[PDB]
Design a protein around this ligand. Structure first.
Ligand SMILES: CSc1ncc(Cl)c(Nc2ccc3c(c2)CC(=O)N3)n1
Ligand SMILES: CSc1ncc(Cl)c(Nc2ccc3c(c2)CC(=O)N3)n1
Ligand SMILES: [Cl-]
Ligand SMILES: [Cl-]
Ligand SMILES: [Cl-]
Ligand SMILES: [Cl-]
Lengths: 4, 123, 123, 4
């Protein structure tokens, strides 16, 4: 999971 | 403020290909010079400008069989159908002309672009 | 010896979401506490172990309406349906418990994992 | 396009  | 799962789109496409390989919920047969290919209308539309136009048509959206132009090569179509469900294109010296022609007909702009580039490199 | 188009899976999913937003070729209604959500069976199966099990069942595969357990929160479902079609999860302090419970019921393992991690960080 |  990432900060888009 | 959403978070994003990097591999989600790839995992969805991998599962859609697993459904295709097991013939689960396929809702159309594409006929290419008597060869038949089963697929999901939504995936075909998502990858091709031609299928997008066909299945948004109020009459054609209900067809279970679509016949492609007789000039379309079944191998070129098979390679492109595999690309649609995997992101992988089996582009070879022996098939590049048939693949580019099929991608131009199917309106798959990114495939047409790589074929043009690979052909230009060989001249 | 294939070549691969990096953005293909993301572009397919983006187009599938465009079809969902315009209600094109949606073939199922998911009912959650009287709220109704239209979707594509194939995308639901590709994202959820529960929908995969439902639509591979010889009787349920033909249903146009699926009713979820009354304990399922419609907002939690809406957030997860958006995630399925975009890879983006709108996870907030106010919805994390409903999102985790819905993801556990839908069998969306990666969502359950991030919810567990975010909850553990807050304690 | 890349070599996978
Ligand atoms: C344009 S809006 C839109 N909405 C939904 C879908 Cl399913 C869709 N597909 C589609 C249309 C055109 C093209 C492709 C896919 C690939 C390509 O090269 N051209 N387009
Ligand atoms: C297992 S073979 C397979 N073949 C095709 C599909 Cl459409 C599918 N989906 C699916 C099954 C289980 C789970 C998910 C999707 C997401 C998750 O967390 N668990 N699985
Ligand atoms: Cl027909
Ligand atoms: Cl393309
Ligand atoms: Cl029904
Ligand atoms: Cl998940």
């Amino acid at each position: 999971w990432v900060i888009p | 403020s959403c978070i994003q799962f990097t591999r989600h789109a790839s995992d969805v496409l991998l599962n859609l290909n697993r459904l295709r390989s097991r013939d689960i919920l396929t809702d159309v047969v594409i006929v290419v010079s008597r060869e038949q290919f089963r697929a999901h209308k939504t995936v075909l539309m998502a990858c091709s400008g031609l299928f997008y136009s066909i299945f948004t048509d109020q009459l054609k959206c209900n067809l279970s069989v679509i016949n492609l132009d007789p000039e379309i090569n079944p191998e070129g179509f098979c390679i492109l159908l595999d690309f649609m469900y995997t992101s992988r294109l089996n582009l070879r010296e022996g098939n590049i002309m048939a693949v580019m022609a099929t991608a131009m007909y199917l309106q798959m702009e990114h495939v047409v672009d790589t074929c043009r580039k690979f052909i230009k490199a060989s001249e």
